């Protein structure tokens, strides 16, 4: 039906397999700290799996009028990210034993990032969609700022090493989302929805399963 269906189907399959792999791999783990990381990390692709399935079956898709056309908007992505992005930030924060204040700042700014992105995606006045994109981007920039300038002296080498790798992976991949949104169907519409869907699938799988494989294979998750 929809040309982007193949990418949604592949996304569903990859998130599903990733979830199952992490689920199996986490069996037997008794270390409290490691359990936290496995729980957070397995839940991420499990949620993504449900939302990709939602998009594939057509439930997480809605039509938004703007620019004089009926624009297909997959709102299920925000329902996904609303829960998965904060969880991913939690993995990074727990890894460096961040204090509660910083965790709340990250989670709250993340909520603002996704919430304003959702508002922008459903906004009927074309020009306003970009106002929301700008605010969401400012929130993302705040998050990236905190990750880099927001624990070193008393920090295990493996912890510092894995955190630096996951932080770099996060900054690169997350930074692409606003660009894809801006040039894709939710924004300027210069890149067709099918290609946009492919881009998000690669980014999502990398930021979730890729990110997860790196974290769960590290000894940093253990006390």
């Amino acid at each position: 039906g929809r040309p982007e269906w193949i990418w949604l189907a592949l996304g569903t399959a990859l998130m599903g397999l990733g979830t199952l792999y992490f689920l199996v791999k986490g069996m037997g783990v008794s270390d409290p700290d490691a359990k936290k990381f496995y729980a957070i990390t397995t839940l991420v692709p499990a949620i993504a799996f449900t939302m990709y399935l939602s998009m594939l079956l057509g439930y997480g898709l809605t039509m938004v009028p703007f620019g004089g056309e009926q624009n297909p908007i997959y709102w299920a992505r925000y329902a996904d990210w609303l829960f998965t992005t904060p969880l991913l930030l939690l993995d990074l924060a727990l890894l460096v034993d961040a204090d509660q204040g910083t965790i709340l700042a990250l989670v709250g700014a993340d909520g603002i990032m996704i919430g304003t992105g959702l508002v922008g995606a459903l906004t009927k006045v074309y020009s306003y969609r970009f106002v929301w994109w700008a605010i969401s981007t400012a929130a993302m920039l705040y998050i990236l700022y905190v990750l880099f300038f927001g624990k070193a002296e008393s920090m295990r080498p493996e912890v510092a090493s894995t955190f630096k790798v996951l932080r770099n992976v996060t900054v690169v991949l997350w930074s692409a989302y606003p660009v894809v949104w801006l040039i894709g169907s939710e924004g300027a519409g210069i890149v067709p929805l099918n290609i946009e869907t492919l881009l998000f699938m690669v980014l999502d799988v990398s930021a979730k399963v890729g990110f997860g494989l790196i974290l769960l294979r590290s000894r940093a998750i253990f006390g």
Copy 2:
């Protein structure tokens, strides 16, 4: 108007009385641990009370097209369960001093269970509704698994005793929900909505007020 109104009214009344009873019973409690259990346990029927009232007044009801008919779907149940089921799991987890990793696993899987159940309840393609039911059921099975195989050596007798009772009550009652959903109006439609509503009221009151009476009368909630 709607034949199932009597069960919604009785459900509203029972949840309301249960809330008031727990509220009174919890007065004077100074023990920190006991306070946690009273807060969690009183909030559960208070939320259920609001959603049952929502259904009674008709606000938590919507019409979903599928199978060639306008099907009355009480979505308010998921708004209820989304918050009450995780809270109930929290009572069980705190009772056994479960570690954060396991708590997150339970809460996250519970969210998936209710979220996919909601998607299934509102899905317009009949066959797909059952795909969502299957995923939600898999999440429930994971939860039941964790409760039984997911703390013994260093565990007070009263704690182990009450937990085992509440765990058995939980497995039996919770396991009935997917069956009721499957044979009821949201699924195969072989059992009429009025009878389905009665079933859920008995299950809800038992899983909330019944469950609550057992827990709050035990000495396990005290340090």
Copy 3:
């Protein structure tokens, strides 16, 4: 377009400036406890900023049929309060080192207060709107009760002093909301929407930025 636009624009500007001020003021803070208070306190007007902008642009506004008319209902307020009121209660609770049980009681009752207020705001049967208002008010009264009768012996003077001031500010300002709602467009409609919007803007800015200035200038936030 809408006469109340000026108050929404001023609200947007004030919440935005307040957010920026708190953001700057919180720079350099290394004290863990102080960080918690700055995070919570800065997030509050940041969220309010987004919802006021939502109302200004028209996204957070919907039409609800009741009383034989199309009533303009700004639902964005509840999306705001759902997150900001619990955060404000968290500031007060952390300030007095409240135990988890009491925190959950406050947060849960707050959720009920806002959730039932939202249901009332969107209810099509006029008389029922007031039933929801009554339940929401009962939840607010419970919260006010807990704040006054729910830690003294072992409590720093500055902490007790600032808490008492913020508690008084909270009881006075919060108590006004149900009155405004009752006499405003969501209720009896005796006070026009434009005036109602002005009232909420003054209350919101005072309960958020005013409240925030008092808290963040106190030494109580430091360990």
